[PDB]
Structure formats: structure tokens, C-alpha cells
Amino acid sequence: HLPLIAITRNPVFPRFIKIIEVKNKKLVELL
Amino acid sequence: VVHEDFQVTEEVKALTAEIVKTIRDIIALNPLYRESVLQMMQAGQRVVDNPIYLSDMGAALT
Numbered sequence: 001h002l003p004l005i006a007i008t009r010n011p012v013f014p015r016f017i018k019i020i021e022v023k024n025k026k027l028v029e030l031l
Numbered sequence: 032v033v034h035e036d037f038q039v040t041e042e043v044k045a046l047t048a049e050i051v052k053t054i055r056d057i058i059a060l061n062p063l064y065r066e067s068v069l070q071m072m073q074a075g076q077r078v079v080d081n082p083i084y085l086s087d088m089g090a091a092l093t
Contacts, residue, residue, distance in 0.1 A: 008076075008077060009075050009076070009077040010075060
């Protein structure tokens with residue numbers, strides 16, 4: 001039960017490492 | 032300021048990608064300015080709501 005992650009134009013292909021940076025800090029508090 | 036654009040804004044962005052890639056190539060081989068500005072604004076960042084201005088900046092480095 002966690003809020004939906006904000007993709008913000010960051011497609012993540014299967015078995016492919018990706019980096020996400022979102023200006024919103026709320027994701028930082030969740031992390 | 033005429034900014035006519037096609038209804039299906041799906042495959043046009045592909046061209047834009049090539050542009051920045053070419054731009055990258057330039058700064059990779061014939062550096063002119065700092066690459067930090069390129070890092071700040073990215074195609075995948077979505078903060079670019081004015082593509083014509085991005086094209087103007089790309090032509091500016093010419």
C-alpha cells in the first residue's frame with residue numbers, strides 16, 4: 001500500500017537499469 | 032510568432048532527438064560551451080514545453 005510512483009517521462013524497460021530524478025521531494029520522504 | 036504544429040505530435044519528436052544527438056556530437060568533438068546546460072534540460076525531463084526555442088538554441092551553437 002504505497003502511492004503510485006511518478007514516472008515523469010522515464011520509461012523503464014524490463015531488466016533494464018534506469019535512473020529517476022523527480023523534483024518533487026515527497027518521493028524522497030517515501031524513499 | 033507562428034508555431035503551427037501537426038496534430039499527431041508522436042513521431043516528430045524523433046527528429047528532435049536526432050538534433051540533440053547531433054548537438055551532443057558537436058560538444059563531444061568540437062566543444063564550444065559547457066555541457067552543464069545540456070544536462071539541466073533533457074528531452075526525457077519533460078520540462079521543455081517550447082520545442083521551437085530548443086531548436087533555436089541548437090542552431091545558436093552553430
